[PDB]
């Protein structure tokens, strides 16, 4: 009720675990995984699953369908995750706090930190960011000790053209 | 003609971005920090002092943004943060990490690499904000040197801590 609702997202299961660890103490969470990974100990209430190599635009349109169910969406910063963030940012109108290693709430607002220049500098924001991307390697994953109900992400249409080499 | 503003915190990267953009319309540029303007090929170069916080630069750019159809930014850490700020303030879509840019009519037709080169992603979008991937464009000298002016920067809200 008065608790915050997160949706966490990644195209990498280990990374999904790190994002869930960051968000864990902060409110209730559901998750999206693109591709493979065993859901055990993930800690989410619900895990939405997309097929491996589902084009990132079809995934983003799927997330967008459920994104109004959440206060914040936290995405692992990978190539795909960043494309998903930019897409969601645009469609929802919410600002994105990028590459964070730290997320705290004093009251209502999200206070974040990210590194700049390889770690030489720390940038803190208190912004209205509702979309967050989480840096790789910054959170050690903890087993959260429960397993989510699994469902399929209802995937959108894809307009991108994909050429492999 | 279409109007472009090109942006970077690195001058060699700004030359790359200009080289991608050059044939497509008019061009002005924003550099954050140091570098020789020679051969940059924009009409005007707005300078901000090395180390100006990215939100201050972004607010400076917002002041002049309505003068442009497109803003193309070198994808560095600062360039990406700027692109995000501008996306959020303007409401425009961003096409990211591009190596190629063409127009059908007004829609941007872009290409980008995925996985350091294994895959090319080709899109048509309404993106008015673009980031260019590092090292994919061979910077050319473009034959002219812009007049120099200072970027009127805005306020900064971010807190910066050095190690």
A15: CATH: 3.40.50.620
Which H or E run includes A127?
strand A121-127
Q: Nearest residue of A to residue B55 by CA position? A: A125
Residue pair A83/A20 in contact (Cβ under 8 Å)? The answer is: no
> Quick check: A122 and B88 CB within 8 A?
no
CA distance A134 to A77: 5
Contacts by residues A110-118 (CB-CB < 8 Å, ≥ 24 positions apart): A110/A72, A116/B77, A116/B78, A117/B77
> Quick check: A83 and B77 CB within 8 A?
no
Residue B131 burial by Cβ neighbours in a 10 Å radius (0-12, 13-18, 19+):
buried
- Facing residue for A90 by CB, picked from B87, B121, B122: B87
> Quick check: A163 and B120 CB within 8 A?
yes
Place of tokens 């998750």: A31
Resolved by? X-ray
CA distance A125 to B159: 7
Shortest distance, CA B126 to any CA of chain A (angstroms): 11
Residue pair A94/A130 in contact (Cβ under 8 Å)? The answer is: yes
CA distance B53 to B32: 10
Residue pair B4/B26 in contact (Cβ under 8 Å)? The answer is: yes
Taking any CB pair shorter than 8 Å as contact, residues of chain A touching chain B are 79, 82-83, 86, 89-90, 93-96, 98-99, 116-117, 119-127, 159-165
Cβ-proximal residues to B82 (8 Å cutoff; 6+ apart), any chain: B7, B54, B57, B58, B61, B73
State the residue range of the domain holding B119.
Answer: 1-163
User: What is the number of other CB atoms lying within 10 angstroms of the CB of residue A68?
Assistant: 7
Q: Nearest residue of B to residue A88 by CA position? A: B93
Taking any CB pair shorter than 8 Å as contact, residues of chain B touching chain A are 77-78, 80-81, 84, 87-88, 91-94, 96, 114-115, 117-124, 157-163
Residues of A in contact with B161 (CB under 8 A): 121-124
CA distance B102 to B20: 10
Phi and psi (nearest 5°) for B75?
Answer: -80, 85
- Facing residue for B84 by CB, picked from A96, A120, A124: A96
What letter does residue A68 receive in the DSSP assignment? T
> Quick check: A79 and B115 CB within 8 A?
yes
- The total of structural domains in chain A comes to 1
CA distance B88 to A51: 30
* A contact test, residue of B57, B73, B84 with most A CBs within 10 A: B84
Shortest distance, CA A45 to any CA of chain B (angstroms): 31
Residue B108 burial by Cβ neighbours in a 10 Å radius (0-12, 13-18, 19+):
buried
CA distance A141 to A15: 8
Shortest distance, CA A83 to any CA of chain B (angstroms): 8
Resolution of the experimental model, in Å, one decimal: 2.0
Strands (E), B62-118: 70-74, 94-103, 108-114
CA distance B135 to A6: 37
Residue pair B39/B144 in contact (Cβ under 8 Å)? The answer is: yes
What letter does residue A137 receive in the DSSP assignment? T
């Amino acid at each position: 009720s008065n608790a915050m609702k997160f949706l966490t997202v990644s195209d990498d299961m280990n990374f999904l675990r790190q994002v869930n660890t960051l968000v864990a103490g902060k409110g209730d969470m559901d998750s999206v995984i693109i591709g493979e990974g065993d859901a055990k100990g993930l800690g989410s209430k619900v895990l939405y699953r997309a097929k491996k190599g589902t084009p990132f635009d079809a995934v983003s349109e799927g997330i967008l369908k459920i994104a109004g169910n959440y206060d914040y969406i936290a995405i692992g910063s990978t190539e795909v995750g960043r494309e998903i963030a930019g897409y969601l940012s645009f469609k929802t109108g919410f600002y994105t706090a990028t590459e964070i290693f730290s997320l705290e709430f004093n009251g209502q607002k999200a206070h974040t930190k990210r590194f700049f220049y390889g770690g030489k500098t720390v940038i803190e924001e208190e912004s209205d960011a509702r979309i967050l991307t989480v840096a790789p390697g910054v959170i050690e994953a903890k087993d959260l000790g429960t397993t989510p109900e699994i469902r399929d992400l209802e995937i959108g249409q894809s307009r991108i053209k994909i050429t492999k080499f």
